[PDB]
Design a protein that fits this description.
Elements lengths: L23 H12 L2 E6 L2 E7 H11 L6 E2 L6 H4 L9 H17 L7 H18 L8 H16 L9 H16 L3 H13 L6 H25 L8 H11 L10 H32 L1 H15 L14 H14 L8 E2 L4 E3 L2 E3 L4 E5 H5 L42 H18 E4 L13 E2 L3 E2 L6 E4 L2
Parallel strand pairs: 2-7
Antiparallel strand pairs: 1-2, 3-4, 4-7, 5-6, 8-11, 9-10
Bound molecules: protoporphyrin IX containing FE and 4-(4-chlorophenyl)imidazole.
């Protein structure tokens, strides 16, 4: 047997001395150098096996997919999920929820209109809101979170909120804080010493409280559904879950009960709102930095879509340049740097090692997004990475923003459609500008952790003629 190489741990402190003040990612990337693509670091008591670069990650996640299909924990939010919900679930509970969760998001939303149709309609709402600002300088963070939320909201509660609704803004508010603290330095620390730190104060409490307030809201909404519920006509994700919960009333092994509903719906909000939203937010910071790319995108929007009909999803196969820019926004923006923790579902033999069942594995998505074996000049923005000589989109093995394998993002289809429809629909109707000149713009994340949080910035949206 034997675990993969690593620094010798110090019990109760692990490799805390072999870490890097920057954060967990720099700690992983630095150790990588000494010990290779696969290694074993200790986050307090916890032995974790880190994976690096397209090849390693792919061999594990794809090659031994079931073996690596387990879910670890995130110290700062486990107190909330405790293994419930379509993300943090495991074994048979997980397979049951994911299967349900895929099919269900696919066909139910407010209006029995398609996922694409809702995103199109949100985009239409977004455009109109932006006209109201008459091209004045704003911070798009709030709006950008608003439009992502409303997609999940339409899907899960079967209704969108008006951008200015106080229920909603309050919700977005709680949301807005938690997601950024999840990636704060403290929460990275809390990752190694939750045993200790779980006791004194810290941000894990405001994270914990805030998330609980959201859960309270999902609580209320469930009850309102539960009562108005009509079996003939499920309205959305929540009704579909109830109707299943009833089909299962006599099944003691069914995983479709209250906790999985709450924590699932929470997960579809946490995942759906936050990553897509900061991706868009980061994409537009790049468009301020590369007005030339922005302009080429707007021109393709012109040749293919035109200035009158709203962008539709299948316009994308006709628009490889724009498609490439979105790939290149995801790749560089690298919103989830060390993936979400996995575990092996069994003793596993891997690259001549043995990894014991249930050991947390960290597939470091970033080291594949910036893997030189697959991307020339990995730290610079170039839509070129995804274009061939003819300007056709060009698949690249190293690009796995949603991770790979059996746990690959359950929302990747929705997220990709959001990116494409929001990007094209804003640029169709608007030009962007910043006070800051391009050369001055600094893409350095304000916070780096389980997620990447891009810096805030001023931007104006100028209505097009
Ligand atoms: C827009 C950019 C997005 C990115 C880059 C992204 C990325 C990811 C990543 C890296 C994981 C971890 C996969 C793993 O290592 O096992 C994940 C999991 C997941 N994502 Fe996303 N996500 C995005 C948006 C969304 C959206 C909009 C939804 C839902 C509507 C969503 C739902 C989920 C769910 C449910 C999981 C857990 C799947 C499982 O464990 O079985 N994601 N995503
Ligand atoms: Cl701890 C954690 C887990 C999952 C996500 C996620 C999945 N898909 C989009 N965001 C973010 C943070």
């Amino acid at each position: 047997g034997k675990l993969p190489p690593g620094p010798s741990p110090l019990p109760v402190l692990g490799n805390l001395l072999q870490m890097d003040r920057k954060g967990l990612l720099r700690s992983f990337l630095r150790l990588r150098e000494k010990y290779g693509d696969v290694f074993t670091v200790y986050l307090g008591s916890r032995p974790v096996v880190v994976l690096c670069g397209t090849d390693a990650i792919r061999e594990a996640l794809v090659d031994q997919a079931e073996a690596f299909s387990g879910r670890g924990k995130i110290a700062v939010v486990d107190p909330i999920f405790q293994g419930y919900g379509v993300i943090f679930a495991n074994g048979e509970r997980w397979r049951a929820l994911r299967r349900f969760s895929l099919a269900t998001m696919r066909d139910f939303g407010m209006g029995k209109r398609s996922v694409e149709e809702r995103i199109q309609e949100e985009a239409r709402c977004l455009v109109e809101e932006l006209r109201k600002s008459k091209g004045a300088l704003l911070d798009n963070t709030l709006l950008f979170h608003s439009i992502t939320s409303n997609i999940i909201c339409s899907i899960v509660f079967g209704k969108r909120f008006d951008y200015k609704d106080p229920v909603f803004l309050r919700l977005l508010d709680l949301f807005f804080q938690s997601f950024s603290l999840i990636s704060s330095f403290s929460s990275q620390v809390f990752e190694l010493f939750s045993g200790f730190l779980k006791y004194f104060p810290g941000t894990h409490r405001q994270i914990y409280r805030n998330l609980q307030e959201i859960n309270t809201f999902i609580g209320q909404s469930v009850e309102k559904h539960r009562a108005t519920l009509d079996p003939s006509n499920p309205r959305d994700f929540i009704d579909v879950y109830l109707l299943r919960m009833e089909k299962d009333k006599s099944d003691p092994s069914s995983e479709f009960h209250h906790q999985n509903l709450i924590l699932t719906v929470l997960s579809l909000f946490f995942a759906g709102t936050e990553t897509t939203s900061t991706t868009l937010r980061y994409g537009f910071l790049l468009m301020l930095k590369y007005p030339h790319v922005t302009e080429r995108v707007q021109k393709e929007i012109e040749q293919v879509i035109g200035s009158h009909r709203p962008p539709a999803l299948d316009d994308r196969a006709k628009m490889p340049y724009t498609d490439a820019v979105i790939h290149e926004i995801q790749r560089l923006g690298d919103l989830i740097p060390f993936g979400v923790p996995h575990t092996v579902t069994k003793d596993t033999q891997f690259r001549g090692y043995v990894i014991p069942k249930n050991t947390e594995v960290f597939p470091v998505l970033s080291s594949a997004l910036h893997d030189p074996r697959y991307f020339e000049t990995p730290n610079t923005f170039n839509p070129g990475h995804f274009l061939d000589a003819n300007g056709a989109l060009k698949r690249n093995e190293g690009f796995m923003p949603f991770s790979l394998g059996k746990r690959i993002c359950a929302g990747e289809g929705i997220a990709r459609t959001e990116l494409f429809l929001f990007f094209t629909t804003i640029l169709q109707n608007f030009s962007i500008a910043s006070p800051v000149p391009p050369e001055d713009i600094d893409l350095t994340p304000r916070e780096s952790g389980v997620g990447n949080v891009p810096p805030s910035y001023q931007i104006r949206f100028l209505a097009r003629h």
